[PDB]
Design a protein around this ligand. Structure first.
Ligand code: B12
Ligand code: SF4
Lengths: 307, 383
């Protein structure tokens, strides 16, 4: 018999982040991951490393180690992420939290600009998670970085207008987050597109669980998103981002170095991140936000091999 | 059916693979979790073979309240010698009940099968130039046989030759040189079997993840788990390398239509007295054993109340209005936990700290808000 090759109706749009020589393209797939005998894969998955605007306080020693000299300096930390191979740098504005430092959009915007100017790669800016706060800071952030095509992370169903508004006025792209549910990701996309932001300026965040803590739901949701794009559902034809780092390093298997029943801590902590990544790369994710440089390097070597 | 069911080993240590019908688990569910095999070379000393198999036996992990582990020992006849190989398998057999995959020449497998055949091993390597001798051994012992060839065309033809010889208890090996080829082969085998009823490919496959870089072997094996391998062979006995694979197989092979829940009743950790703490949580098995594990691990005898949230985690049920003050209060009375303790204090997951006041008035129990992660329970109980 003959190699079975699917005739796919459509494709995931190509999203471009950054501007000028520091551009990065994602998406564009007209086939399932790596099945290029029946479709195109214009872009390989892309990876980012996280940089916090304020020093992480609850990070395991093994994760701080690769950034120990730059962890208190967002700019230096971001240059280091590029040095470690990140395609994109992801700045998490933790200090914006209203229950924490509750910093203003103006304060936060100066740091996003500082970081942005210092690196030769595109910038992804993640908020604090509190919808109300994020909607307030992103329009100020988007304004300061106007024209730099950054990726503002997280418009949700309850807060997208201010953020989509900032993307459109100031030329940025947006991440649309909905909790592991096709119809909800779809509804959000529809509402964003209703403001006339183009589908190629949107990346879907299904709000995954790491390996062992919800990864199967994440994996299936992402597969349904890719199949949706391929078969023609224009509402699912957007690239997918997975916050791998954030979730994998929360796993006990990756945080408790003292558990003899699970073997060598250093190895399992890293495999926890690399396996969540390879599994979600197999599901159809496009942008992977990682935390540990070693996980990043090994996945990239894995990608060289599978591509 | 699309893919034959094939069994390696016997008696409950048995590995059943095949009878898969979809390419994406959300279409139905994947039916039979792939086996994981660990490699053992017959050139090792008697002492070495035993030490290694003993480490293989320790590649078992409790996950969501169940023991899960690797399932086969792949003995490799690197010695080239049948006497050496036969004795090595006998040695490994003395130290484990896991079924074997016998990797070796026909003469090595035949010596070995005299004693190992009874244990229903998987024979490794009916190839283009030995397939006739291999099929004869497989038939004598009626044991599963791997058909190994480079590429889909060669593979399918060898399979047809062997099935023409009357044997169909098979496992497939398309010999990828790298994981790019591996993904391609696994995907096509699975597609042609299911979408086209292509018979030569209607059998489970075996994959190898032997990379000496352990991050790479783990990633290659992860891809094979997610992508249709029926048996995956590694060469690491490091528990850290197998843990994520076992978890990934558990996860990928879980039925998507329903989460696994635990029965909502009170669970006793260790042998609690009327003085032991009472922990409130949900009946999502993953959540409940996260908690059970932490408590038993700290050696704290206690009572655990997994509120029935239809098997949903704590923030999941909460957001779905299924972990309310009212529901938890009712379980406090529902569960019969009161008869069990002399105090009237219950510990709430720290993540729903807000429910405290309302849950407290209403239930008549003193609600203590615990850490957000069950991992801080030991330090919370100490203080
Ligand atoms: C997998 C998943 C699902 C799966 C279901 C899994 C399940 N069986 O519960 C599915 C896809 C079905 C699902 C659905 C929804 N989900 Co959901 N889901 C997740 C995800 C990715 C993982 C959840 C998980 O398995 N966690 C792991 C376990 C172990 O967590 P855990 O129970 O909290 O228990 C830990 C702690 O609380 C604590 N603990 C537990 N018990 C106790 C007890 C004591 C005494 C103590 C001290 C501590 C303690 O220790 C544990 C270990 O660290 C998470 C969050 C994430 N990745 O961060 C989102 C998440 C929980 N989901 C969320 C939501 C909102 C939903 C929905 C309501 C979305 C919707 N469709 O509207 C739906 C539910 C309704 C429905 N089904 O229609 C939110 C909830 C938070 C919120 N409300 O904002 C999250 C956080 C996503 C987000 N918004 O960022 N989800
Ligand atoms: S008709 Fe079918 S079973 Fe008979 S020789 Fe042809 S292929 Fe084989």
């Amino acid at each position: 018999v003959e190699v079975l090759k699917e005739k796919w109706n459509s494709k995931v749009v190509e999203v471009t982040l950054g501007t000028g020589d520091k551009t990065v393209t994602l998406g564009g797939d007209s086939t399932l991951p790596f099945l290029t005998f029946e479709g195109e894969m214009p872009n390989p998955p892309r990876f980012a490393l996280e940089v916090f605007d304020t020093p992480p306080t609850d990070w395991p020693d093994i994760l701080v180690e690769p950034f120990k000299d730059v962890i208190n300096d967002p700019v230096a930390w971001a240059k280091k992420c590029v040095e470690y191979g990140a395609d994109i740098v992801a700045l998490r504005l933790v200090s914006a939290h209203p229950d924490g430092q509750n910093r203003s959009g103006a304060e936060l915007a100066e740091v996003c600009k500082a970081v942005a100017d210092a690196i030769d790669v595109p910038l992804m800016i993640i908020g604090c998670g509190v919808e109300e706060k994020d909607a307030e800071i992103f329009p100020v952030i988007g304004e300061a970085l106007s024209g730099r095509n950054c990726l503002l992370s997280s418009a949700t169903k309850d807060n997208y207008k201010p953020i989509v508004a900032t993307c459109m006025v100031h030329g940025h792209s947006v991440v649309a987050s909905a909790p592991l549910d096709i119809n909800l990701s779809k509804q959000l996309n529809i509402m964003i597109m209703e403001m006339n932001l183009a589908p190629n300026r949107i990346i879907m965040d299904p709000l995954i669980g790491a390996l062992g803590y919800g990864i199967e739901y994440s994996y299936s949701i992402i597969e349904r998103m890719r199949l949706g794009a391929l078969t023609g559902d224009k509402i699912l034809a957007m690239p997918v981002v997975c916050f791998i780092g954030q979730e994998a390093w929360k796993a006990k298997e990756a945080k408790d170095p003292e558990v003899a029943e699970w073997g060598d801590y250093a190895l399992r902590a890293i495999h926890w991140e690399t396996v969540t990544t390879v599994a979600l790369i197999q599901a159809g994710g496009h942008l992977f936000v990682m935390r540990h440089p070693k996980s990043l390097a090994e996945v990239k070597e894995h990608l060289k091999r599978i591509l | 059916p699309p893919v034959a069911l094939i069994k390696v080993g016997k008696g409950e240590k048995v590995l059943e693979i095949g009878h898969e019908t979809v390419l994406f688990r959300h279409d139905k569910r994947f039916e039979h979790p792939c086996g994981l095999a660990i490699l053992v070379e017959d050139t090792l000393s008697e002492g070495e073979i035993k030490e290694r198999v003993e480490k293989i036996n320790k590649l078992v992990f409790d996950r969501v309240g169940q023991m899960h582990s690797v399932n086969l020992v792949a003995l490799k006849g690197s010695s080239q010698d049948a006497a050496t190989f036969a004795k090595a398998v006998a040695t490994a057999r003395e130290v484990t009940d896991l079924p074997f995959i016998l990797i070796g020449t026909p003469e090595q497998l035949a010596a070995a099968l005299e004693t190992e055949g009874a244990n229903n091993p998987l024979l490794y390597a009916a190839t283009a130039d030995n397939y006739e001798q291999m099929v004869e051994l497989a038939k004598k012992y009626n044991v599963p046989l791997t058909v190994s060839a480079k590429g889909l065309d060669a593979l399918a033809e060898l399979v047809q030759k062997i099935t023409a010889l009357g044997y169909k208890n098979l496992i497939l090996d398309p010999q990828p040189e790298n994981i790019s080829e591996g993904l391609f082969y696994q995907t096509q085998i699975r597609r042609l079997a299911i979408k086209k009823l292509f018979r030569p490919f209607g059998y489970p496959t075996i994959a190898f993840a032997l990379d000496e870089n352990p991050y790479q072997a783990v990633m290659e094996a992860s891809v094979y788990i997610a992508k249709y391998a029926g048996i995956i062979v590694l060469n690491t006995v490091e528990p850290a390398d197998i843990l994520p694979l076992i978890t990934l197989r558990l996860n990928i092979y879980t039925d998507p239509q329903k989460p696994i829940a635990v029965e909502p009743k009170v669970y006793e950790i260790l042998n609690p007295g009327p003085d032991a703490p009472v922990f409130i949580t949900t009946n999502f098995s993953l959540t409940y054993f996260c908690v059970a594990g932490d408590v038993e691990g700290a050696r704290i005898p206690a009572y655990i109340l997994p509120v029935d949230t239809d098997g949903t985690s704590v923030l999941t049920a909460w957001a779905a209005g299924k972990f309310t003050p009212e529901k938890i209060a009712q379980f406090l009375k529902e569960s019969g936990i009161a008869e069990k303790v002399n105090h009237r204090k219950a510990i709430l997951p720290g993540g729903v700290a807000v429910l405290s006041g309302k849950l407290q008035e209403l239930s008549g129990w003193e609600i203590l808000v615990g850490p957000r992660e069950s991992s801080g329970i030991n330090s919370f109980i100490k203080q």
